[PDB]
Amino acid sequence: SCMSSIIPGWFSEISPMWPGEAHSLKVEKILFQGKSDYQDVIVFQSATYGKVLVLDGVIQLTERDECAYQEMITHLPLCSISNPKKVLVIGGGDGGVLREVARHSSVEQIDICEIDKMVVDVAKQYFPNVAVGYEDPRVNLIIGDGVAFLKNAAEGTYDAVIVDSSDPIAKELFEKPFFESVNRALRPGGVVCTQAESLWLHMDIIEDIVSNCRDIFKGSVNYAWTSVPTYPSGVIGFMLCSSEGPQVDFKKPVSLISSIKSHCPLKYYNAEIHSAAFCLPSFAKKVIDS
Amino acid sequence: CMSSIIPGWFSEISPMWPGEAHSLKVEKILFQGKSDYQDVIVFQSATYGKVLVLDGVIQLTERDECAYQEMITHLPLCSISNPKKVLVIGGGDGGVLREVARHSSVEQIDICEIDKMVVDVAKQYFPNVAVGYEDPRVNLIIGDGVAFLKNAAEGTYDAVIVDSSDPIPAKELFEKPFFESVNRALRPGGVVCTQAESLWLHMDIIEDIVSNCRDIFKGSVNYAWTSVPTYPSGVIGFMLCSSEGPQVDFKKPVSLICPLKYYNAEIHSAAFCLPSFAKKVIDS
């Protein structure tokens, strides 16, 4: 179904989470097809987006546009607070989020949970220039469930939690108890940033996500969005919430983001787009503002 | 262009976005003409309502057109005081006209659409938006806007909106002479807003439009972008250019404005905050 039976080497991203639409990509090579204990895993060499990671038929990243997601999900929370030291990432992807967290020189510890070792192994083999992400000596990789890991975490441990999840299908990561777990694992005024889907496609799912966060997190609660051409509807959003404690202002950065530089310039994130990301269209704005 | 990758699905293929296509499941085909100018399809889509297509390229869908039509219209029109005379190049489905008509200081809306079939299709298959054409201030010309514009009285217009297709004879709308034509027909400090493609797919083309624009318009020259799921890459952008004359600040609207679904003063400003890869190139 996802691979065209009509004309060779077209992949089409079909889902009932985005009914009646597919982003089709010309595929040169499948580099990897694989079935873990959790999910179907495909990597292809696309004609125009470089390498593409697909889990359960859903595009997770392309080399060409991953920067828009990976820089926004990392820098929106981490540039909003001073001197973040301890960070938790839920979901490993290709390591590109870890690479973004590691630009922040105040960070000392990056704990990351990925349930599926196949996803880690696939990152290291097929996406090695971004999967160096995993090798930063600050990084502590747990192959295990992130929901359990967070129940089990010491209270008040983290400056920041980044929830780099797939779609709510994964469904527990969008619910009140998981958020209560996050609230408890954050230091007072610690921040969470989560994958919060498409304003065009899932207004109903997002209204509930913001209601749960408004209830659990007593600091700040904001919603941001970014252009990601190879996500469905060409955009995805983020919950930014702070726990009870010091003032947090997600709307502007505190901080802009070594002799030997390990990173290229930011490709997408900057201090102006940080603010712009919180200016929603009128159809979305009405709802999310309460 | 129909069932080219999936049976029952429209796929938007073009060497303007190599290696990719947006695919929409088609409930039914509503129209199929071949005017003296382009191949015209309207189809009823599964989930984006009615869809207009010219030469295999998506012009609009009922579900997301608000994001294009409200931004190409209100970014220019909310950046100046009491616009009275307005020229639109391109008719689409009358959506842009409907949005221009929200501005109560506007007296005259000249619009050029070379292809009459586009207009007839709009009124027939998109009637609730095609009302844009019916408003008493609208002066509809079935003719070449390039020609209409070179034939205009110098300094006549407060604003021109270029709601063009892709730079594919449409390519004239992207070149110095047409830009000189506009700079001329605008009053001093008058503004133009142009369809200016995707920062993800067309940085080269955009760079050339900006540079061209910066030679001609001696007021402000700015680029803005917006989410449109059914345009290639999911975003489209706009040149905003003011002619020599009173200062225009496109990032800070001077005024506020069947309700608006997308545009608002906050998104007005955010529309000029480009990603770092675009922001460097587009600035100097």
Numbering used by the authors:
A (entry chain B): 42 to 210, 213 to 300, 305 to 337
B (entry chain A): 43 to 210, 212 to 300, 311 to 337
Question: Can I see the authors' text?
Answer:
Longer polyamines are produced by aminopropyltransferases (APTs), enzymes that catalyze the transfer of an aminopropyl group from decarboxylated S-adenosylmethionine (dc-SAM), a universal cofactor of APTs, to a polyamine substrate. Thus, spermidine synthase (SPDS) utilizes PUT as the substrate for spermidine (SPD) biosynthesis. AtSPDS1 and AtSPDS2 share the fold of polyamine biosynthesis proteins with the characteristic two-domain topology. The active site of AtSPDS is formed between the N-terminal and C-terminal domains.
The structures of apo AtSPDS1 and AtSPDS2 present the PEG molecules (absorbed from the crystallization solution) bound within the active site. The conformation of this linear ligand mimics PUT, providing the information about the substrate binding mode inside the catalytic pocket. Additional β strand (Ser46-Ile48) is formed only in chain H of AtSPDS2 (one of the eight chains in the asymmetric unit) creating three-stranded β-sheet at the N-terminus. One subunit of the AtSPDS2 (chain H) presents the state, where no ligand is bound in the active site in neither the cofactor binding compartment nor in the polyamine groove. The conformation of this chain stands out from the others and presents the possible open conformation of the active site. Comparison of the chain H of AtSPDS2 in the open conformation with chain A of the AtSPDS1-CHA complex shows that the AtSPDS adopts two significantly different conformations. In the open conformation, the biggest conformational difference concerns the region with η6. The preceding loop uncoils and η6 is now moved toward α8, over 10 Å away from the position in the closed form. Therefore, the negatively charged active site is uncovered and ready to incorporate cofactor and substrate.
